[PDB]
Amino acid sequence: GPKFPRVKNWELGSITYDTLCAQSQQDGPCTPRRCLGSLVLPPPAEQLLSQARDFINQYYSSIKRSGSQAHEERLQEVEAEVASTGTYHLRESELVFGAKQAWRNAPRCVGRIQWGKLQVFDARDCSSAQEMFTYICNHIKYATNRGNLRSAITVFPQRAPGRGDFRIWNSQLVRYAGYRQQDGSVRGDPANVEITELCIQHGWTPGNGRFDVLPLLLQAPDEAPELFVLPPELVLEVPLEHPTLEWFAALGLRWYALPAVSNMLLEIGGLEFSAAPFSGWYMSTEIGTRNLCDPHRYNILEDVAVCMDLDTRTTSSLWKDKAAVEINLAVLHSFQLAKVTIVDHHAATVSFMKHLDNEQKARGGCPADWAWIVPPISGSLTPVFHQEMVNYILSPAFRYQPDPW
Amino acid sequence: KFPRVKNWELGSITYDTLCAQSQQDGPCTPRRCLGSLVLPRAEQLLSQARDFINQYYSSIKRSGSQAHEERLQEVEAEVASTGTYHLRESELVFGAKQAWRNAPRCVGRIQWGKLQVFDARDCSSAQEMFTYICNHIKYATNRGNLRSAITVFPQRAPGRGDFRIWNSQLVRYAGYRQQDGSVRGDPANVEITELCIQHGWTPGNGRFDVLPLLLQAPDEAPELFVLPPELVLEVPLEHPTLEWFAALGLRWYALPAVSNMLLEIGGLEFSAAPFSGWYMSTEIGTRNLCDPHRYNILEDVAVCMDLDTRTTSSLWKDKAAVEINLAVLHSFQLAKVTIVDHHAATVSFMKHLDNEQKARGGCPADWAWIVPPISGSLTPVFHQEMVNYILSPAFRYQPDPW
Ligand code: HEM
Numbered sequence: 001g002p003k004f005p006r007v008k009n010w011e012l013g014s015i016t017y018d019t020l021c022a023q024s025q026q027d028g029p030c031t032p033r034r035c036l037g038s039l040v041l042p043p044p045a046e047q048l049l050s051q052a053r054d055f056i057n058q059y060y061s062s063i064k065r066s067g068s069q070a071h072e073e074r075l076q077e078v079e080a081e082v083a084s085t086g087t088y089h090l091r092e093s094e095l096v097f098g099a100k101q102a103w104r105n106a107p108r109c110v111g112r113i114q115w116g117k118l119q120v121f122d123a124r125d126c127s128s129a130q131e132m133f134t135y136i137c138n139h140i141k142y143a144t145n146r147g148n149l150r151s152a153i154t155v156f157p158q159r160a161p162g163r164g165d166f167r168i169w170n171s172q173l174v175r176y177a178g179y180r181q182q183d184g185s186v187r188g189d190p191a192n193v194e195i196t197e198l199c200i201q202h203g204w205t206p207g208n209g210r211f212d213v214l215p216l217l218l219q220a221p222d223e224a225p226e227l228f229v230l231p232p233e234l235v236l237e238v239p240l241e242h243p244t245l246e247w248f249a250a251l252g253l254r255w256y257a258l259p260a261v262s263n264m265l266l267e268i269g270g271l272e273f274s275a276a277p278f279s280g281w282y283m284s285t286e287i288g289t290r291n292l293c294d295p296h297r298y299n300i301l302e303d304v305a306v307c308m309d310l311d312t313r314t315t316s317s318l319w320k321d322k323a324a325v326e327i328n329l330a331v332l333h334s335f336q337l338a339k340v341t342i343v344d345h346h347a348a349t350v351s352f353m354k355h356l357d358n359e360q361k362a363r364g365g366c367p368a369d370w371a372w373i374v375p376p377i378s379g380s381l382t383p384v385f386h387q388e389m390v391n392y393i394l395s396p397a398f399r400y401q402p403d404p405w
Numbered sequence: 406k407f408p409r410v411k412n413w414e415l416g417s418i419t420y421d422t423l424c425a426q427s428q429q430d431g432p433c434t435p436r437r438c439l440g441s442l443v444l445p446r447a448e449q450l451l452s453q454a455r456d457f458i459n460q461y462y463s464s465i466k467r468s469g470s471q472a473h474e475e476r477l478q479e480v481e482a483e484v485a486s487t488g489t490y491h492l493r494e495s496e497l498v499f500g501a502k503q504a505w506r507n508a509p510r511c512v513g514r515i516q517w518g519k520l521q522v523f524d525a526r527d528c529s530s531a532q533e534m535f536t537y538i539c540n541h542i543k544y545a546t547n548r549g550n551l552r553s554a555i556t557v558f559p560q561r562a563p564g565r566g567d568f569r570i571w572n573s574q575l576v577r578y579a580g581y582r583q584q585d586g587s588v589r590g591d592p593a594n595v596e597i598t599e600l601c602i603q604h605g606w607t608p609g610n611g612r613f614d615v616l617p618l619l620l621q622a623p624d625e626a627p628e629l630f631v632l633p634p635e636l637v638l639e640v641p642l643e644h645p646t647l648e649w650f651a652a653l654g655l656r657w658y659a660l661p662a663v664s665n666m667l668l669e670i671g672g673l674e675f676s677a678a679p680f681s682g683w684y685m686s687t688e689i690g691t692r693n694l695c696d697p698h699r700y701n702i703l704e705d706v707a708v709c710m711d712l713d714t715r716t717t718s719s720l721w722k723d724k725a726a727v728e729i730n731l732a733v734l735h736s737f738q739l740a741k742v743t744i745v746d747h748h749a750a751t752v753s754f755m756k757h758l759d760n761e762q763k764a765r766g767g768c769p770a771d772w773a774w775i776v777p778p779i780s781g782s783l784t785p786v787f788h789q790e791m792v793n794y795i796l797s798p799a800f801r802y803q804p805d806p807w
Pocket residue numbers: 099103106108109110111112114118151152153278279280281282283286343348372398
């Protein structure tokens with residue numbers, strides 16, 4: 001039949017063909033010889049120009065003026081700017097379109113039904129670490145909006161030839177410190193040990209709790225990073241309690257409201273925005289299953305199972321599964337109680353199936369990473385588990401970048 | 406060239422060099438990954454045979470010996486004259502074990518070296534196929550102390566139909582289309598249930614009616630055989646603490662025996678070679694009983710648990726699912742029938758990955774299939790990167806014979 005990937009949904013028995021993959025101009029890690037789909041990790045004016053032209057064509061197609069005078073003029077304008085300077089700059093509306101496309105294009109995001117609704121803060125005039133901090137605080141305030149979260153991204157100046165990058169050292173705007181102990185264990189989040197020590201190496205006076213909010217290490221071009229402490233009033237947190245298990249609250253667990261990724265690179269038409277933090281709202285399993293139950297994270301499964309009085313001596317009691325469910329329920333219940341936006345893994349995957357149907361119609365497909373889209377608990381209980389998916393790289397895109405240190 | 410493989414829970418890293426031995430292409434390309442898809446969209450025979458024979462002699466540490474060389478001549482002489490060849494029983498046994506070892510979707514591979522191989526290549530009729538199958542079941546079932554086994558029927562031959570078992574598993578429950586478009590029994594087996602009736606089977610009207618086997622000998626219409634009830638071990642499902650669970654009248658058979666896959670060894674193809682092991686509880690508790698397109702009992706169990714099925718945020722689905730999987734383990738354990746839970750199973754697979762890293766420099770594995778359908782990240786395999794590729798001997802899918 002059609003010479004494109006045939007995609008099947010095994011619950012519904014429905015079929016679609018992905019034609020959008022034909023627009024991919026960047027190769028992933030697989031080959032006919034072996035699939036590396038489960039791996040977490042994957043200028044020449046000549047190449048830049050082709051990427052820039054592709055992006056401008058995308059922009060004009062999106063506003064239905066492809067082939068028009070303005071379209072051709074913009075293309076000539078970009079070529080001229082690159083011709084004389086080596087780079088070029090995006091117009092305001094082009095940046096807005098590009099940022100939304102990058103989210104729309106992210107294969108690992110299950111929240112893409114929301115892609116068209118993104119507040120894009122243009123911070124390309126930012127010229128100091130102190131100002132980066134101002135922009136970040138405004139982002140957090142706007143995005144947090146007292147618990148009624150709003151998706152947002154703040155874009156700082158793009159990488160420039162012969163100049164240092166703007167960089168936020170932290171992986172997220174909000175994260176808990178991880179303190180290496182005497183005995184070799186860790187108090188707080190084990191994932192943040194290195195960033196926590198870098199903050200200390202940089203003058204931060206460390207706390208000693210399990211949930212100490214880390215300061216931000218912000219770096220303006222060609223300068224050492226500066227340290228900034230987030231005012232507590234700005235970081236909304238949710239104390240965790242369980243709807244029926246009264247002792248859960250005594251565990252003293254909590255989590256912050258805003259998931260804000262700050263170390264990814266936003267690439268649009270060949271231009272690279274090394275500092276462009278973006279945020280949305282949590283899907284409950286990110287907190288309840290990964291952050292709280294991963295063995296290499298807070299690892300609280302055994303503690304909660306002991307509290308629930310489960311037989312933690314044998315795997316067949318399914319004590320891990322039982323505790324995980326209650327921990328996830330507590331996260332949902334607590335966020336709901338505190339009126340902070342959150343979406344459970346069932347609702348999220350149901351909305352992602354709608355997004356796939358929308359994109360099939362709008363673009364002929366949707367790049368999706370099955371392993372990342374299917375939730376960490378109750379996998380086959382959600383509709384995405386039964387949906388085959390095609391994964392490929394489209395641009396604009398969010399890409400990982402090496403840590404600045 | 407060789408992929409770096411990292412385990413994110415432990416921080417350990419390995420390099421897969423075994424993938425360089427793959428000679429068959431998967432579905433992916435540098436442009437797009439199709440790893441989530443369930444199914445794929447004489448000089449050669451001789452090279453595959455040589456490689457296999459090479460594999461065999463290396464396995465018994467007699468590579469290069471006289472026996473190795475003579476065997477290679479034998480194979481070449483037979484292919485040159487007849488266009489095919491035949492395997493010795495010892496080689497067939499080594500071949501079947503390697504095909505299991507190479508199966509990327511199997512989480513139970515730590516057991517790969519323990520497999521009873523039944524040579525059924527001297528089978529000339531559907532009736533004989535049935536006798537072999539019955540003996541396989543009796544042996545594999547062993548009154549509840551399941552033993553892994555495979556029965557190999559005659560290889561495919563040029564200009565001649567295949568020996569085939571039409572059923573996808575030796576034991577399966579009927580799926581009957583009701584007037585109102587619904588289905589009584591297993592919805593996954595509607596088509597096969599209908600073929601059986603069409604081929605003279607007197608259907609039942611229950612929810613767990615064991616289907617009869619449609620066995621096909623070369624170029625003949627398939628024949629119907631009803632398995633003797635006393636041969637099909639089943640486990641009534643009850644819950645350790647919820648008394649009403651047993652009232653649901655749920656049950657499942659003890660023996661998972663795949664019968665529609667093709668076994669390929671040294672270029673030869675065995676279109677009928679049913680194999681069986683023992684269940685991992687989530688196959689029954691999560692997929693068979695809870696899939697929307699299967700028995701779909703989540704809502705019923707949820708209501709019996711008087712859960713709030715009004716909203717997803719109450720996690721009623723997750724809660725019911727866990728109790729159903731608990732009932733399966735409890736029941737099989739009560740009935741003293743072999744079964745392995747998903748935590749124990751994945752822990753053994755991690756050991757297997759380590760054993761194979763030392764033994765062969767890698768292990769082909771399909772992450773999406775190895776990670777259980779519930780509590781994925783609560784198991785060690787979730788945090789383990791895997792490389793997937795096709796090695797031979799191999800088990801592969803083949804067209805339905807109708
Ligand atoms: C509105 C709510 C949103 C929800 C519920 C959501 C949910 C998720 C989830 C569950 C993941 C996988 C995260 C992980 O396991 O580490 C993810 C990844 C991702 N999301 Fe979304 N997302 C949302 C908004 C956004 C926004 C506003 C952007 C960008 C404009 C975005 C960009 C991404 C990207 C690039 C990734 C992958 C990053 C990586 O590989 O680490 N998401 N999202």
